[PDB]
mmCIF file of C-alpha atoms and ligand atoms in Angstrom:
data_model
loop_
_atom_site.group_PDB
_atom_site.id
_atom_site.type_symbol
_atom_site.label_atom_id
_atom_site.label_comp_id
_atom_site.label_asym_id
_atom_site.label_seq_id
_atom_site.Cartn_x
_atom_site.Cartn_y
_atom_site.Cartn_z
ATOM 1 C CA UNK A 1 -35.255 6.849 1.641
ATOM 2 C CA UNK A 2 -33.624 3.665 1.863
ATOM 3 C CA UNK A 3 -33.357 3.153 -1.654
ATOM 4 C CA UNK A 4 -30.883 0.445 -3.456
ATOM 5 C CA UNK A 5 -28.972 1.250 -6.519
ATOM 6 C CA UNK A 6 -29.620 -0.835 -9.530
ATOM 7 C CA UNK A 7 -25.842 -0.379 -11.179
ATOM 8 C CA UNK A 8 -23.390 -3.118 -10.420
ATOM 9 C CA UNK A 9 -19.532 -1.853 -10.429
ATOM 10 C CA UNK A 10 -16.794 -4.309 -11.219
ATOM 11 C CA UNK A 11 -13.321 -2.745 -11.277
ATOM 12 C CA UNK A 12 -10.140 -4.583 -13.016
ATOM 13 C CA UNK A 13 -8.517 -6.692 -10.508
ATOM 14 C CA UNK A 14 -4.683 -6.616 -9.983
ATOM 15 C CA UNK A 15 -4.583 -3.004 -10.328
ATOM 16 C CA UNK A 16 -2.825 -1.857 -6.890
ATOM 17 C CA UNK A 17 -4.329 1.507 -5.178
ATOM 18 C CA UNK A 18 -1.509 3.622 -3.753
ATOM 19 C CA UNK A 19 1.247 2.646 -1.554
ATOM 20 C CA UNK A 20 3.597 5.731 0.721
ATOM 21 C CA UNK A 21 6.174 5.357 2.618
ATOM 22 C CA UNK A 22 6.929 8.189 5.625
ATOM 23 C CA UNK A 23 10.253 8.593 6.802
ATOM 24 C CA UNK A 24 12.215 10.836 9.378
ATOM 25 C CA UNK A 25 14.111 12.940 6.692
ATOM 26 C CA UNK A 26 12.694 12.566 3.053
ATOM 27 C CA UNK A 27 16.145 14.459 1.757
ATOM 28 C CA UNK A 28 17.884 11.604 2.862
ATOM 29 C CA UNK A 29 14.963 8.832 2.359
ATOM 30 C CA UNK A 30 14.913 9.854 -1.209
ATOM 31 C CA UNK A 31 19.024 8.552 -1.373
ATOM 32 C CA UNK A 32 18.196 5.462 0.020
ATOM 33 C CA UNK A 33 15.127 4.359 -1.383
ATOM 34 C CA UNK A 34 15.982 5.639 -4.909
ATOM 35 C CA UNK A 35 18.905 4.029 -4.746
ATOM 36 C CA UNK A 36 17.025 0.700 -4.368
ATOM 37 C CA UNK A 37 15.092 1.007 -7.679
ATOM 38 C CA UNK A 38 17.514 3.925 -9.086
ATOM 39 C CA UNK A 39 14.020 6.601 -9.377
ATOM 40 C CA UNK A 40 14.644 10.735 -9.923
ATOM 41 C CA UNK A 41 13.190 13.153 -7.863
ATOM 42 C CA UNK A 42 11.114 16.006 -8.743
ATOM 43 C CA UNK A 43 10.519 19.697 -7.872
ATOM 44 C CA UNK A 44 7.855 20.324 -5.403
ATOM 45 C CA UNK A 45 4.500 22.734 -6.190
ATOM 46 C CA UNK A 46 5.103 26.034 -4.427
ATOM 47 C CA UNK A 47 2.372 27.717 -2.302
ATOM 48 C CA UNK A 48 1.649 23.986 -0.569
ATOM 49 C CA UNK A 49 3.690 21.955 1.497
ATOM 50 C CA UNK A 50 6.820 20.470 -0.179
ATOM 51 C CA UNK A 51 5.521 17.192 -1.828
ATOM 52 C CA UNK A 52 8.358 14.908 -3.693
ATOM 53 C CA UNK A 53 6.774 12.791 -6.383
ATOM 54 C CA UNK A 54 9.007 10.436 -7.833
ATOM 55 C CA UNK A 55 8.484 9.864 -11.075
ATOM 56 C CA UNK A 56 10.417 8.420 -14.226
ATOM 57 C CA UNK A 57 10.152 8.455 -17.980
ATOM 58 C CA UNK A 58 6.923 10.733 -17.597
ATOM 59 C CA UNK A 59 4.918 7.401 -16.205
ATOM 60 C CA UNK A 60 3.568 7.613 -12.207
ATOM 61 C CA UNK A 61 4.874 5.355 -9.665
ATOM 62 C CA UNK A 62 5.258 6.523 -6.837
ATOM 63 C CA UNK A 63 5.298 9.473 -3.576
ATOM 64 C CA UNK A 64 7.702 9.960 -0.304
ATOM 65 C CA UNK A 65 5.748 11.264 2.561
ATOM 66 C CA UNK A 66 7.573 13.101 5.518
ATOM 67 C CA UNK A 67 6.686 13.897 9.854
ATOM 68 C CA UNK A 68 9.087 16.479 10.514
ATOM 69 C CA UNK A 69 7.956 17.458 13.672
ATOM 70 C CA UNK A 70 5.380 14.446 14.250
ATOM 71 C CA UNK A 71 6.825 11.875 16.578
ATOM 72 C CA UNK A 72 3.305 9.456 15.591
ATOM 73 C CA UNK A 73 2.780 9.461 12.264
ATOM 74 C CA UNK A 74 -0.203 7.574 10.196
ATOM 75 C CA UNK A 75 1.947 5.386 7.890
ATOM 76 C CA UNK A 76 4.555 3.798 10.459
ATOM 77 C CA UNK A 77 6.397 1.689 7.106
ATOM 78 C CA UNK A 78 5.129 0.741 4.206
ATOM 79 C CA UNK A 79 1.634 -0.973 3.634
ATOM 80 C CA UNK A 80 -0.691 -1.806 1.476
ATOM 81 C CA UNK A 81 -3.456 0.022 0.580
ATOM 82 C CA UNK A 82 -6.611 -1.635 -0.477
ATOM 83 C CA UNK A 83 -9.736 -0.278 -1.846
ATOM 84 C CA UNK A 84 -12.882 -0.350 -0.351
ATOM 85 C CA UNK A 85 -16.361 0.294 -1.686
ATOM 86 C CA UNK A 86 -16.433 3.637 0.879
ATOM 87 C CA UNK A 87 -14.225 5.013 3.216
ATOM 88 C CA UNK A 88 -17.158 4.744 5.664
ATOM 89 C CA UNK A 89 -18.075 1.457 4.454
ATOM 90 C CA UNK A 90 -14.996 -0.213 5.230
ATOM 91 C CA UNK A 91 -15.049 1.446 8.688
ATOM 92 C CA UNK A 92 -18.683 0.717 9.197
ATOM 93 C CA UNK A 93 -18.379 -3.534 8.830
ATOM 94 C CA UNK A 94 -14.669 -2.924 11.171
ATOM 95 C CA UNK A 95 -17.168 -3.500 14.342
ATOM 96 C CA UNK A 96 -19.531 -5.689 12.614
ATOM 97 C CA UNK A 97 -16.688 -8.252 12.174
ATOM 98 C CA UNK A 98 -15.114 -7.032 15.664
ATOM 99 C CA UNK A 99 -12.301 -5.344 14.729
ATOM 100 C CA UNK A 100 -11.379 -1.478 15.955
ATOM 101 C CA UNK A 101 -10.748 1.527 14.080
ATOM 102 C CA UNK A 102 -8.073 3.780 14.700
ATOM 103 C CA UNK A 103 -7.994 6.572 12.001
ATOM 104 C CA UNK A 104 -10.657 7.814 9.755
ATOM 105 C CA UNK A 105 -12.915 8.695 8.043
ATOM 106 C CA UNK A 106 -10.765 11.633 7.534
ATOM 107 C CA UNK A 107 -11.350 14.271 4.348
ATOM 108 C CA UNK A 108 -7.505 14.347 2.838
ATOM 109 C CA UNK A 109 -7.884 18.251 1.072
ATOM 110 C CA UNK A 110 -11.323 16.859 0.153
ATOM 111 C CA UNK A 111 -9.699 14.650 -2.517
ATOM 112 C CA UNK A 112 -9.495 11.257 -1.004
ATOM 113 C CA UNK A 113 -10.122 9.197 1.977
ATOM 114 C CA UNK A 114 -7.709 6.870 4.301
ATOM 115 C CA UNK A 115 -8.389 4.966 7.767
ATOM 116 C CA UNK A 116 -6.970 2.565 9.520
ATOM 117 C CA UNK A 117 -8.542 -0.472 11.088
ATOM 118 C CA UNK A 118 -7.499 -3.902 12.821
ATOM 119 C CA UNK A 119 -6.648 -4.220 16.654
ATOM 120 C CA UNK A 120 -5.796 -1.473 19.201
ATOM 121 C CA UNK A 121 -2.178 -3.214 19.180
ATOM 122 C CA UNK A 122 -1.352 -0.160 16.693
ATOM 123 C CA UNK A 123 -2.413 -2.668 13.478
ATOM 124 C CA UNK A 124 -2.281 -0.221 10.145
ATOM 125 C CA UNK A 125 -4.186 -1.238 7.306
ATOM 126 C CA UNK A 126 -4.260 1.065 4.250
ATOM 127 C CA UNK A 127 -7.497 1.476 3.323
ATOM 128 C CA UNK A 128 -8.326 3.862 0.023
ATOM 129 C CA UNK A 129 -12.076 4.532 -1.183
ATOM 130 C CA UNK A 130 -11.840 4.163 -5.034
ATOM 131 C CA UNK A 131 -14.486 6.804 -6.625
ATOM 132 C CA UNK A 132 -12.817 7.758 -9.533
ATOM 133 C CA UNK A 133 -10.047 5.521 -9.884
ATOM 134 C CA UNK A 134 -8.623 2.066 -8.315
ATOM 135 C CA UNK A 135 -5.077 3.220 -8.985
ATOM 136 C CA UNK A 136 -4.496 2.227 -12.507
ATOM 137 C CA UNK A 137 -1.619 3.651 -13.322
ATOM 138 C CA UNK A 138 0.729 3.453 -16.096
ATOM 139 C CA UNK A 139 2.072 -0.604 -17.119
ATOM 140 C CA UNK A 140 5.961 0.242 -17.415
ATOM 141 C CA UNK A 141 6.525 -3.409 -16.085
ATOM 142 C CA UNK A 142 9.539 -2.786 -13.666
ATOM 143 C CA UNK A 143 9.609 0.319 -11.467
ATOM 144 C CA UNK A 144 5.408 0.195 -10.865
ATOM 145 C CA UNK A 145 3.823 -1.585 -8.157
ATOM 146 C CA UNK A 146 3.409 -5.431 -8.327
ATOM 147 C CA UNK A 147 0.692 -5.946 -5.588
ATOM 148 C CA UNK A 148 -0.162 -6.189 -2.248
ATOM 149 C CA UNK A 149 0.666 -8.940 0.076
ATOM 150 C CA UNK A 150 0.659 -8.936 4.140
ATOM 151 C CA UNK A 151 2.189 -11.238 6.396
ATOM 152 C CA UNK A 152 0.195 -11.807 9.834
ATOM 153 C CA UNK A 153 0.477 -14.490 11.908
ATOM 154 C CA UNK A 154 -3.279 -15.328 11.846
ATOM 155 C CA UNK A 155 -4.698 -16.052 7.765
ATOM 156 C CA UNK A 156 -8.153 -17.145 9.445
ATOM 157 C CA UNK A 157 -8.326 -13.888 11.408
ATOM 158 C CA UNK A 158 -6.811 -11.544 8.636
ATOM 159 C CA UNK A 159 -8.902 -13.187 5.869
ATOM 160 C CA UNK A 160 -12.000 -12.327 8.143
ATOM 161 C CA UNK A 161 -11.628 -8.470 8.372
ATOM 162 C CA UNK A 162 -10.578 -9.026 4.598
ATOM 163 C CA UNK A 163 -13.648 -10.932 3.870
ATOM 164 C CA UNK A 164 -15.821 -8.873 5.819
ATOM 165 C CA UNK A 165 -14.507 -5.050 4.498
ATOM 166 C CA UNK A 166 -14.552 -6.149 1.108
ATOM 167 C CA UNK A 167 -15.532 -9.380 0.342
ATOM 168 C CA UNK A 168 -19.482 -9.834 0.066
ATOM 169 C CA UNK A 169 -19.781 -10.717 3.764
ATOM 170 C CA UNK A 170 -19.638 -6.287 3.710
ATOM 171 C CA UNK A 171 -23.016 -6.390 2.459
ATOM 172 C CA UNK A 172 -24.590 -10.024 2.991
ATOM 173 C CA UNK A 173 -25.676 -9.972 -0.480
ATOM 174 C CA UNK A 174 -24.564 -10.452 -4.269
ATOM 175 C CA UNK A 175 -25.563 -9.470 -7.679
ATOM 176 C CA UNK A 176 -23.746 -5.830 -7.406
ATOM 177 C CA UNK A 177 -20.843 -6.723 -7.413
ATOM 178 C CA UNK A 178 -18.290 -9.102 -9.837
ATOM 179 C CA UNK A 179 -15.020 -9.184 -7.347
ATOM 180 C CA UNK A 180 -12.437 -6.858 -8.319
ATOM 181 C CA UNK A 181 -10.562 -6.898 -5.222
ATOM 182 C CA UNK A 182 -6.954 -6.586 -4.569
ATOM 183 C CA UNK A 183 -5.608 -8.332 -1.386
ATOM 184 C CA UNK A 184 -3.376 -11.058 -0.328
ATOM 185 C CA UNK A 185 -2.010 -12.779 3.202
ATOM 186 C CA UNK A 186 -0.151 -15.528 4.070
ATOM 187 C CA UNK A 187 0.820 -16.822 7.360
ATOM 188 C CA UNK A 188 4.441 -16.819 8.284
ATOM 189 C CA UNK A 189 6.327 -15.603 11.399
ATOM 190 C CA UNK A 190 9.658 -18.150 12.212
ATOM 191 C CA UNK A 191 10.623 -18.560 8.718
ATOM 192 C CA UNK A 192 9.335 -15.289 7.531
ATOM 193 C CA UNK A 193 8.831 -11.546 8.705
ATOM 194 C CA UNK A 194 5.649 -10.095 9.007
ATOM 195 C CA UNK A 195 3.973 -6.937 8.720
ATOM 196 C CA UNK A 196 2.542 -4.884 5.807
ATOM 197 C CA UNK A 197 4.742 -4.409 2.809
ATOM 198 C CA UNK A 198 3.879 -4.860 -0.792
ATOM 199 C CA UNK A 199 5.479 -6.121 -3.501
ATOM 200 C CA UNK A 200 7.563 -4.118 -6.690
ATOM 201 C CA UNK A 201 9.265 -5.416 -9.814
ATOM 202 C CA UNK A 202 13.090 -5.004 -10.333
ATOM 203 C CA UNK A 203 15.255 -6.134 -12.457
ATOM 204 C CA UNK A 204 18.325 -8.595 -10.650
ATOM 205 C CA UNK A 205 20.897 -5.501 -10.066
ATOM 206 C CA UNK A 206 18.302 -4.157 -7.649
ATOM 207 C CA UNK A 207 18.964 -6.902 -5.060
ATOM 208 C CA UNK A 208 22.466 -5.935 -4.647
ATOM 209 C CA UNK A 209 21.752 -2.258 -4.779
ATOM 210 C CA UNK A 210 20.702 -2.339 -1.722
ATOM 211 C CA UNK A 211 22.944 -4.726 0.111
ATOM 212 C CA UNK A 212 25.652 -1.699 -0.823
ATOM 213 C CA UNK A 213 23.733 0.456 1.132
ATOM 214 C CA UNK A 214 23.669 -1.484 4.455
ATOM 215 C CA UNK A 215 20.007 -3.129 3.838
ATOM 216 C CA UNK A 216 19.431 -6.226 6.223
ATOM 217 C CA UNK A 217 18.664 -9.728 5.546
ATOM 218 C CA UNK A 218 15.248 -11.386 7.108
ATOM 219 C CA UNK A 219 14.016 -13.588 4.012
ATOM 220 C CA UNK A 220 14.445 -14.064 0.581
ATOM 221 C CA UNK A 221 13.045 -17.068 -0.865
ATOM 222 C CA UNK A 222 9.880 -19.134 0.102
ATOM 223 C CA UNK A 223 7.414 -17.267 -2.560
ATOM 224 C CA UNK A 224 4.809 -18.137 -4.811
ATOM 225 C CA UNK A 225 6.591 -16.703 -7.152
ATOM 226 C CA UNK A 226 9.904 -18.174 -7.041
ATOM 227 C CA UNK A 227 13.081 -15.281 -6.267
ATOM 228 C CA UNK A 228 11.906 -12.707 -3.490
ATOM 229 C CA UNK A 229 14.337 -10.547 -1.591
ATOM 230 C CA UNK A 230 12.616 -8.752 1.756
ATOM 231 C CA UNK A 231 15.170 -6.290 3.066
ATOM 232 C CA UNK A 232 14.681 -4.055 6.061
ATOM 233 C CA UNK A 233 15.738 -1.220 5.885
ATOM 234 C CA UNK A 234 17.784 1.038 8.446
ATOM 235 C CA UNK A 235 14.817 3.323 9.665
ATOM 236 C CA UNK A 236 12.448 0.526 10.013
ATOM 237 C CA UNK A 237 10.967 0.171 6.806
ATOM 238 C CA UNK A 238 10.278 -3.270 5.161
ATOM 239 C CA UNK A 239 9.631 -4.198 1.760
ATOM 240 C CA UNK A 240 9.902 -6.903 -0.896
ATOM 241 C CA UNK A 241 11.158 -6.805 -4.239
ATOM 242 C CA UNK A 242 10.871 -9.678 -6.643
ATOM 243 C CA UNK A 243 12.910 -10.093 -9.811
ATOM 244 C CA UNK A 244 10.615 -9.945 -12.976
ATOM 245 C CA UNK A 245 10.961 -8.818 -16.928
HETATM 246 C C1 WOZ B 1 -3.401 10.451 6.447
HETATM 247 C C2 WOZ B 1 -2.946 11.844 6.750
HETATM 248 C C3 WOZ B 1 -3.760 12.648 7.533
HETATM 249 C C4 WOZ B 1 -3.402 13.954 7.850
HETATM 250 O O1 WOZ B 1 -4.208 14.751 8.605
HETATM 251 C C5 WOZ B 1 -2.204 14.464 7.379
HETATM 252 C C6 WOZ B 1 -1.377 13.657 6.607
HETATM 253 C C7 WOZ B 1 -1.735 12.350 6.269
HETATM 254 C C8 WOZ B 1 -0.746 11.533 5.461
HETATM 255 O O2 WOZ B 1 0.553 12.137 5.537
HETATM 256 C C9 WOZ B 1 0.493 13.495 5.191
HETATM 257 C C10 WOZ B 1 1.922 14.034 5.163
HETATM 258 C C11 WOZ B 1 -0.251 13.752 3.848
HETATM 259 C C12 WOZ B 1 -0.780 12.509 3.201
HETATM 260 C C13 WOZ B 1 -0.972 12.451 1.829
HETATM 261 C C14 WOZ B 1 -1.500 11.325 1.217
HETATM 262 C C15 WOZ B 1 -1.825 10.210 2.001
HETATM 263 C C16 WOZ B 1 -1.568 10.241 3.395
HETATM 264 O O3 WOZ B 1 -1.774 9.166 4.170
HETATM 265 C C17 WOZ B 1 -1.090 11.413 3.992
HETATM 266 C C18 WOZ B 1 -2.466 9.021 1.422
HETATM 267 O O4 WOZ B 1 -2.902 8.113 2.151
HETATM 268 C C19 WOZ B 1 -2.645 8.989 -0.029
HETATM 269 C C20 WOZ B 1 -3.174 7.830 -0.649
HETATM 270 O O5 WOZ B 1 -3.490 6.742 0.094
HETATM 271 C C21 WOZ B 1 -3.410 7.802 -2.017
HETATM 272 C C22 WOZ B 1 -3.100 8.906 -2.797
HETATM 273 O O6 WOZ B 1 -3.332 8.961 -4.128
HETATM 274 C C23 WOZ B 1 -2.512 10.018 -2.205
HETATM 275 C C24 WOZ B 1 -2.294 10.080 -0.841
HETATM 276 C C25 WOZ B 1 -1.702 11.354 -0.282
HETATM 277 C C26 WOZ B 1 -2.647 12.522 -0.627
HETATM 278 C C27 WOZ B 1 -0.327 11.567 -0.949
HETATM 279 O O7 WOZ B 1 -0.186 14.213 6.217
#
């Protein structure tokens, strides 16, 4: 009856949530995209649909999603996926800020929870709902996620649906809450690509492991952090990797 809860949650920040990648033909995703990192692929469950999780040195990082027969998947290339205080939270301050959603909320084999949200344009934005978890996964260093950063062409607007799924805006209030967030944008578009694509740890020999494979150049300097290397890959998939030990 319109109650409040009097526990506040703060979650470790940094910690990314999840991030798949769908492709036309995982057999031959898994050459390329392995071959980037250099991962090892794993047998599938039997009595389900085959599932490749790719995994190394008995430590998670990371699963290959697949259409088949599905011309319009969910995914469309990599993104990030940040967590929200409720899959129907998220998608309940979309219109409050004026955005659209697109997906969701959907009941994933009753285990988790993604939507999309942003502009009818076909704008994907991962969006998790962290009950149990906020992806905290195993620290290996290189070979894990490194976090999430989008490129738009509009900060202001971006930071808004940001601001307003997650940041306190969501709620008008604080006090339950500390700000344990993952998210990050930037505005770029001539002297950068843009789209959805987080960032992973590599060591140097990664960068040319993919130029071998036909990878193409957009950008690969101009970061916070000093060496980046974006490649785009053949099927349409675009990712960063920066250079870190
Ligand atoms: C949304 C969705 C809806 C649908 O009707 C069918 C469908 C998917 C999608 O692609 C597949 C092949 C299955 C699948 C599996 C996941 C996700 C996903 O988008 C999809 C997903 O978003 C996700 C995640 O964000 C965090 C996780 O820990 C695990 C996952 C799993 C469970 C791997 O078919």
């Amino acid at each position: 009856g319109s109650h409040m809860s009097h526990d506040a949650v703060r979650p470790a920040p940094g910690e990314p949530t999840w991030v798949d990648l769908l492709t036309p033909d995982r057999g031959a995703a898994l050459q390329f995209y392995s071959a980037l990192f250099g991962w090892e692929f794993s047998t599938t469950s039997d009595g389900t649909s085959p599932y490749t999780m790719c995994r190394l040195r008995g430590r998670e990082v990371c699963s290959i999603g697949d259409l088949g027969e599905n011309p319009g998947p969910a995914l469309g290339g990599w993104s990030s996926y940040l967590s929200v205080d409720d899959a129907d939270a998220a998608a309940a301050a979309v219109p409050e800020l004026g955005g659209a959603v697109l997906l969701g909320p959907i009941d994933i084999l009753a285990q988790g929870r993604m939507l999309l949200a942003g502009d009818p344009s076909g704008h994907r934005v991962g969006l998790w709902q962290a009950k149990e978890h906020t992806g905290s996964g195993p620290d290996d260093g290189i070979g894990a996620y490194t976090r999430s950063e989008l490129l738009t062409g509009a900060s202001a607007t971006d930071g808004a649906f940001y601001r307003g799924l997650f940041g306190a805006d969501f709620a008008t209030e604080s006090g339950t809450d500390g700000g344990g967030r993952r998210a990050a944008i930037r505005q770029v578009g001539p002297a950068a690509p843009s789209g959805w694509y987080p960032c992973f740890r590599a060591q140097e020999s990664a960068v040319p492991a993919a130029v071998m494979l036909g990878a193409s150049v957009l950008l690969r300097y101009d970061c916070p952090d000093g060496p980046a290397v974006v490649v785009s890959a053949p099927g349409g998939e675009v990712f960063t990797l920066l250079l870190t030990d």
